[PDB]
């Protein structure tokens, strides 16, 4: 029934979701198309999904779709974490950006989020104020924590005064460093107040990206060369998992140091199945369906043992994200392909019949590579070999 | 019994052999060590082997080893193609090379070859005058065809006079181009006389090397990108086989144009299982145990259907060949590892029990990768993708 | 009008032609589509075209199209050089190539070429036996000159016997080196006989390609750096023209040395307007519409002053030639784009109204870049700067 009951409870697995099927978000998916996705995710035991803005129709249409499916079937159950997108002044225009001022359009985006939580209170269990909106590298739109605090407080006040349910949880979904787990430049009074104001912290961590941008944890190191190729991948991927755990834990340590006790949940993490830039064959050798599956399963095990939700990125490949370059890793974060093929990670579920009778865009849910593990393994590369310096410890 | 009976007869499979186990040929293998190898090869249906010089003790010791095994077991059968190494003047010294004069040491090398054919006429069926000794790129030692002709004619004269068996076959083992199948620069009078003088032509062809030095045949081309990874390798490797066939056939065409009918046999070809230079991960993606197996089997099928012997390169990895770089492809041409592990190509024979009871240096004959095909496939890379131009044919 | 009247006569400008509009030749253009092209070329003063094979329907359909247009308009005039494609044994199969034997399919290709010259003797003025079929780098299909000679002689015998007009000219269209103007490896008896058997020599020369493969002529050298950009391009492009002239003249010198007098015509040369490989921004800086125009005009001036035809490559961009890579230079040799836009070279003619009322695939003949020379010039790069050594002459 409530966010407190759902989050951290492995009977309600979370996922990040977008239902766009073409190279532009101008092509909005229809309610019928979104219902296809909902049925597929529901069959997999996904019970809560996450969304990014309320400016385009997409989020509103997902709620309509879920409502229709709940009317068709009284046992159908899907919940939503609704994202209200937050911008700095002049974001997405040709005018000079100001990261110390807010977009005049944040107010109406918060208003539209509120309206949706009110029309669909049986589905909407969380509002997230911003998506990576405080991280200092989000050059196109980032804001100061004072702006997120402002809107989180606005939402907490609407709950106090009775315009929103007292059980509706408010958060902001952001990088670990924005929540205080990294550079101490972020450790400002406004962040402390924000950590007080939210009901929980939605934290993002991305080892896959750091296989390029901070690669110290990524490789085959020393004696590992003498191990089996299978074992080398297992060990390397385990380091990737532990790296994420460290970043999450760093946020927990920060909040403990402020004398604040709040739940932490993973709002975003993922590992793409293909890259023609930094993360694939021409760079760090991270991206393929096998390593994606390993990462997904490690993240599930960790989060279910720690009682954290993980809104894993992402349900379906979304080819609008790097529109002019289809091989870009942004287009390959799905557990399924755009056409509804199940990647290695979900082959086991296809075999058990979990998606029987279900369709995406006319296609049945088929295994990628025709379920041929050997054909996948030929395409998989090993992580790069590195040498380790021994410290005199 | 005779070379004419053995060559081109698939009941007598050929191989190129060296028994050195260390990074220098100064460490001669013992007779006991060589017997280990002979037993292994014999178990595999190898019945004739090839050797490169008679200067070091190695070839003489192999003959001693085979003799001991034939005394122990009346059904043991192994034959030898003995290589007499030919040099140009000042080869392997610090004096100026002269490729139009011969080394003074050739004479005694030919004498030693003759002495061995005489002491072991039941084993030695062929003498080869030179190994790639005419090919113009063998900068360290190459000679003109007049010098090979000279020694071939010397050996044919010893046969005529009765000092050697009339059934002993004489050849020279050389690159396809040296035998007239390539640049017409080679098409000189002395080569025509050499082709007349030999009993047969021992021809080398190396697609693996040409994956770097002449790569037009090597890759995944056009529409092939849409095929399965398994199929892509099969197609690419088939082009490699066909390339070798074309080079061998080019020699057959050249001798036919001279009005000469001689048998042709493959004296050398091979595909290494590892390379840290041009042929592996840092270059053409040719070298691994899977592609080696594909090449070996294709060469066996082709040669057995064409009634050619193939002295396939090579039985065992020999780590002295690129002594200062163990990852060099020269050290990885074996069907077995230096420690006696059977590479992918022979896994099937290990499972049938062909090598049971047999040992190399104390080790039983084990499968590489623990016989785990998946582990191998992770290490295998695909050939590079290439541009296909369509001609208006 | 006879081949003798047409070739070398600037009242009958020549061009290489294909009418394919899609990325595969499986999509044959219709007779209606081909008529569109013929009208466009005719408006430009093109009076003879060249074709590459008579296996696919394309060449036959061009003849049908020209015939229809001659029936519609008694002043319409278009002639054809018909290419009979010649292959070596196993070309375009997965079997081993043999460049010393011929394809079993050559005979019927020659038969189909003779049938077309017979059904359309008012249009077909030349048969060309082969297209680059002797050049030793055409690895996929090349043949020995004996094979071309065989079929040229066959055709000359059909003319003698009266099955073909005595005024029909026979040739082979090939690289300057194949005709004896380069490596003397080509200087064999069968070539001399071929030079005697043909009515003329159709010679190909490609400076554009040599800006990568033999770049000694290509660049901005020494003092030229101080010159205007406009002038640096003019000087460099003049060297490209003179390079082609030298290659053509080298063929003329070779036939003179044999005491043979035959006309020489340029069967193929061209300069692509775009390249994403060796010839554009990522390599030699050759390819753009400005340098193409300069080359085209230089080749026209040279050929018209020397009384040579130039079957310039090519009328329209043909995107099937490098099907899997649309930025490949093979797809950009047109004077027009696939959509019927006139590249820089023909802007002047669009302005004079030469193509008024004419259409390709529904589109009028428009200028590329909207006829904005400045917009073109921004995209054009200068040739690379090179080291000039002064000799002591
Ligand atoms: Ca030469």
Author numbering:
A (entry chain C), B (entry chain B), C (entry chain F): 38 to 430
What's the paper's own text on this?
The enzyme FbGH17A hydrolyzed both the debranched laminarin product of FbGH30 and the native laminarin, although with a markedly higher specific activity on the debranched product (KM: 1.6 ± 0.1 mM; Kcat/KM: 36056 M−1s−1) than on laminarin itself (KM: 4.3 ± 0.1 mM; Kcat/KM: 25744 M−1s−1). In order to examine the molecular basis of substrate specificity the X-ray crystal structure of GH17A was solved. Compared to the monomeric GH17 structures, FbGH17A has significant insertions and is larger. The structure of GH17A allows for the deduction of the molecular basis of substrate specificity for the laminarinase. Based on the GH17 complexes obtained for R. miehei, a model was generated of a laminarin product involving five monomers bound to the catalytic groove, two on the aglycone side, and three on the glycone side. The reducing and non-reducing ends of the modeled glycan are free, suggesting the protein can act in the middle of the chain as expected for an endo-acting glycoside hydrolase. Furthermore, given the conformation of the modeled glycan, 6-O-β-glucose branching would be possible only at subsite + 1 and anything further away (+ 3 or − 4). In other words, within the native polysaccharide the enzyme would need a stretch of at least three free β1,3-glucose moieties to act. This structural data supports the observation that GH17 activity on laminarin is bolstered by the action of the debranching enzyme GH30. Here, two enzymes that are likely residents of the periplasm are shown to work together towards the complete degradation of laminarin in a highly specific manner. The X-ray crystal structure of GH17A reveals the possible molecular determinants of substrate specificity and the propensity of the enzyme to be more active on unbranched laminarin.
Phytoplankton blooms produce large quantities of beta-glucans, such as laminarin, a soluble β-1,3-glucan with β-1,6 side chains. We cloned and examined the genes encoding FbGH17A (locus tag: FORMB_24720), FaGH17B (locus tag: FORMB_24740), and FbGH30 (locus tag: FORMB_24730). The data indicated an enzymatic functional cascade in three steps: The exo-acting β-1, 6-glucosidase FbGH30 removes the glucose side chains from laminarin. The endo-acting β-1, 3-glucan hydrolase FbGH17A degrades the remaining debranched laminarin into oligosaccharides.
